[PDB]
Design a protein around this ligand. Sequence first.
Ligand SMILES: CCc1c[nH]c2ncnc(NN3C(=O)CC[C@H]3c3ccccc3)c12
Length: 167
Amino acid sequence: VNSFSGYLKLTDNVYIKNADIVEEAKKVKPTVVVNAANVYLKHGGGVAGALNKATNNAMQVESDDYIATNGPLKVGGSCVLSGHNLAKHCLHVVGPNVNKGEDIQLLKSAYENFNQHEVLLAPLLSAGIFGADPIHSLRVCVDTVRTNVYLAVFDKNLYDKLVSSFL
Ligand SMILES: CCc1c[nH]c2ncnc(NN3C(=O)CC[C@H]3c3ccccc3)c12
């Protein structure tokens, strides 16, 4: 038993809710919150901008030190950093940005990072301002992640259709 409440069970291990990941994280304080990062960990907008703002920019300060030491992530890759006031850890995961010509097949590689963590709170990767189809992304998530993932989808009408049309 865990503390996530109000989710719809899509499969044995994937759950979904219409919620803001920032508010879910503050309420639950999960072991792992996933950020929809870019390779530079520049958390300017989208989920990343919202998460970083909720940390009072501490996520960005930590991220800039990480990049100065290690260089950029790979598209499809990830790193584990602090969760600050939102979670124990933040798993920064880079899905492909199709608006940059990046291979959408890399979305599966991105979701594979979730399997290194038994339980996660996460957004749909590559959705929103990353430009991919959120229905597709949900399919890749379900077909790739084997650990327990709680998906927060902030957009109401997108959420409404995802669960009503999920096979
Ligand atoms: C962005 C606003 C927002 C605040 N808190 C959130 N919590 C969860 N998901 C969110 N957005 N997203 C969707 O509804 C579907 C795709 C996803 C998204 C990811 C990355 C960038 C933009 C959008 C949000």
